[PDB]
Amino acid sequence: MASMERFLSVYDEVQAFLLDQLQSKYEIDPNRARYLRIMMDTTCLGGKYFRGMTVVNVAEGFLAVTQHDEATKERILHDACVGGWMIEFLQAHYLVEDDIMDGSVMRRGKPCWYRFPGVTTQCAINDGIILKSWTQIMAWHYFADRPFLKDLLCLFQKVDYATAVGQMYDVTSMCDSNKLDPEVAQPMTTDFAEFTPAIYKRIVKYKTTFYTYLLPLVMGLLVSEAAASVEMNLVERVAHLIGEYFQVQDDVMDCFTPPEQLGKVGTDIEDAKCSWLAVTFLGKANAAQVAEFKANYGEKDPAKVAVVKRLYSKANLQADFAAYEAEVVREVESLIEQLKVKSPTFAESVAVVWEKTHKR
Amino acid sequence: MASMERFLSVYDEVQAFLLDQLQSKYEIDPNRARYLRIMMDTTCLGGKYFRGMTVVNVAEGFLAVTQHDEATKERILHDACVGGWMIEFLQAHYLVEDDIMDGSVMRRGKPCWYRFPGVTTQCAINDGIILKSWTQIMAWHYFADRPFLKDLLCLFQKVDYATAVGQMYDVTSMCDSNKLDPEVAQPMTTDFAEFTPAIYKRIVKYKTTFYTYLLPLVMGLLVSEAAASVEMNLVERVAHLIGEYFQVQDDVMDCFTPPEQLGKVGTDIEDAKCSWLAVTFLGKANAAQVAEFKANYGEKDPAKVAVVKRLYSKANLQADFAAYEAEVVREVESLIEQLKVKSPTFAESVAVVWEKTHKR
Ligand SMILES: CC(CO)(CO)NC(=O)Nc1ccccc1
Ligand SMILES: CC(CO)(CO)NC(=O)Nc1ccccc1
Ligand SMILES: CC(CO)(CO)NC(=O)Nc1ccccc1
Ligand SMILES: CC(CO)(CO)NC(=O)Nc1ccccc1
Ligand SMILES: [Zn+2]
Ligand SMILES: [Zn+2]
Ligand SMILES: [Zn+2]
Ligand SMILES: [Zn+2]
């Protein structure tokens, strides 16, 4: 059976499980079960299932080189699917709540969940809570007796927390650190002294790379009982490296990809985000360009946003991007080679992960 | 050492642990560590610590009748404290997010967290995420090798989910079920046909009783390794019974307790909540009174809110409250007696739980 069909069937099975449990143990009525079904579908489905399918891919890699009974192969693939869904549901939680937090309008060419007429923020916040609780319900049901349950739960928990910490880094990235204070309304930075490579890297490492690259890879190793084919330090290093690149690509697209291709109107400039474009621009600008950036960034006025974009185009950030890209290629290739020592298979899964990221 | 001082010291220790970990493993800077310290203090502290101290109380009960080395007594009490804090932090998560969801103004005589000037909703949603993630960080650190870890995590997870389901029941309680639809803005009920005892009981069972009464009791049994001194069905039954009563008391206070005593301006009437007062009123009203209720409930206009309150006073709901109270006394007493069969000690902890609830 093809991987994607297996993964999508397991979605149906897990949905059915979750909703039947709600009826049998949580006293739910049909109409609220329907609302939850529709929320699950709207918030978990319609992406490329990169995260979840990486779990499946890593597990299939190991199946090709490990002796097992057929029933065990099926069990391992079922567990990889269920694990993949845990990650997709965790993403769903974060996108729901992030869209509310940011006051976002669209996501992947549809209204943000909270914007749906019969949803509202009051319900959507809670819906996103439930989305993450469902990851744990999945795990405890499908993996109750599994030898990797402890490790899987403890890793999930660490990634989830890393992610929330990353969110805090992101939403606070246009404040001056020394001015953080719950008691005082936070002004936007005037000096942009915290728009540095090191600070950018910390935001992205936590906000995105743990759940998007580390967790899928390591959960594939966990359901495969294969964590000893790898040096975990290398898996981390490669995950953080590819995940940074992913986020740089996303930063570039927010500014330059037409909205109907992007699936939204990018607002990083108006939101004063610490984006790769801003940090790279500030690293090569002259004094006059820096002043012009400060006078126009983080402002809703479309004239000012057009001034920031022009500053970026004139600064030939495309060539800094090509150079960053090259260096990442080098380093990813290096890490793949080091991974081949202990596991050719796992190194190949990481190559596939890289290829998929490098072309989007 | 007195229980409360032990509990408050363990808060300090757990805070220090969490914030030191953020510096050592999550690359946090001092100013963001300070923001998190202040958020933890503002959102977890200043209540009566009923939930957390019930864990400690149940565990002390067992210590008085169980042979142990001193070091073991300390360990058990430390674990009860840490478990108590997990519950207090879980409450904190739910109050932060609930206050945002509801657009609330105050809570326990201070502004809701999201209303703090240097917080905002954008940060507060995430802060409440972190508050719940911290429960898991506590558990995995302090209970890593403990024999009750699995059971504790699986129970925590079930309560958390019950709670989110309860929130969904609550926020949807003034809608007609058959009209739930993400695509359609939800009108308030006109018939109030879902303002019934059975429906009220379902809201409150899930929204409050699992985290406020069930979890504290059962976590005390878990850290005591005492789950075999009880019949768990009875613990559930008593938890749900006392927790319902707690919520009825809270419903009555929202309407009738002066705001400076309440710690907020009660808005259940304007919010069209399915409160005990509304359900009891509808169960004894005549046709004209029902019509007057419908024409005035769920409306911000203070004149209409005064009309609902007058309808409640004239309906002598105080006497329905005395009658409900009596029946709960009967049933709680009955359950305490059944609990004494297997455990006098645990039955006494449940009596103390009842006494504390019955007088507030
Ligand atoms: C060293 C490496 C590979 O190039 C992997 O950590 N990343 C960077 O160089 N990131 C960076 C981010 C923002 C601005 C400038 C640089
Ligand atoms: C279309 C989009 C854009 O973010 C949103 O659904 N998804 C992806 O591009 N996912 C993806 C992630 C890593 C590597 C390859 C693909
Ligand atoms: C039976 C009992 C004890 O009295 C325990 O479940 N609860 C009730 O009677 N709850 C109730 C709630 C709202 C309105 C009317 C009744
Ligand atoms: C003052 C207040 C009012 O809700 C809010 O902090 N706390 C309590 O009354 N807690 C409590 C819970 C159960 C039994 C006894 C006390
Ligand atoms: Zn965001
Ligand atoms: Zn972006
Ligand atoms: Zn609420
Ligand atoms: Zn209330």
Helices (H), chain B: 3-25, 30-44, 50-63, 70-102, 120-142, 149-171, 197-204, 215-223, 232-256, 259-262, 276-282, 287-296, 302-314, 317-342, 344-358
Ligand index nearest the alpha carbon of residue B263: 4
Strand partners, A111: A106
**Please, which residues 176-205 of chain B have a Cβ atom closer than 8 Å to chain A?**
177-178, 180-186, 202, 205
CA distance A128 to B101: 12
Answer yes or no: is A191 a known binding residue. no
Ligand 1 centroid vs A197 CA: distance in angstroms? 6
Cβ(B110)–Cβ(B45) under 8 Å? no
Ligand 7 centroid vs B249 CA: distance in angstroms? 16
CA distance A68 to A65: 10
* A29/B123 Cβ within 8 A: no
Per DSSP, A225 falls in state T
Alpha-carbon separation of residue B211 from A48, A129, A139, B58, B202 (angstroms): 37, 15, 21, 16, 15
Q: What is the CA radius of gyration of chain A?
A: 22
Per DSSP, B202 falls in state H
Nearest CA in chain B to A155: B140
CA distance A223 to A152: 8
CA distance A289 to A292: 5
CA distance B155 to B171: 24
CA distance A246 to A262: 14
Closest CA to B230 of B338, B82, B91: B338
* B28/A165 Cβ within 8 A: yes
DSSP output for B80-110: HHHHHHHHHHHHHHHHHHHHHHHT--EETTE
CA distance A88 to A94: 10
CA B249 to chain centre: 13
CA distance A116 to A100: 12
Closest CA to A146 of A216, A225, A214, A85: A225
A107: part of which helix (H) or strand (E)? Answer: strand A106-107
Q: Which residue, chain included where needed, has tokens 């409450």? A: B91
Closest CA to A333 of A357, A316, A350: A350
CA distance B11 to A212: 33
What resolution in Å is listed for this PDB structure?
A: 1.6
Ordered domains of chain A (ranges, CATH): 1-360 (1.10.600.10)
Report the amino acid identity of residue B333.
Answer: E
Indicate the SS3 state at residue B185.
Answer: coil
Task: Please tell me which of the candidates A101, A137, A184 has its beta carbon nearest to residue B126.
Answer: A101
Indicate the SS3 state at residue B120.
Answer: helix
CA distance A346 to A231: 11
Alpha-carbon separation of residue B101 from A35, A171, B128 (angstroms): 18, 20, 12
Residue nearest to atom 9 of ligand 3 (CA): B324
In this structure, the strands spanning A110-111 and B106-107 are unpaired
Alpha-carbon separation of residue B51 from B55, B83, B98 (angstroms): 7, 10, 18
Residue A183: phi, psi to the nearest 5? -75, -15
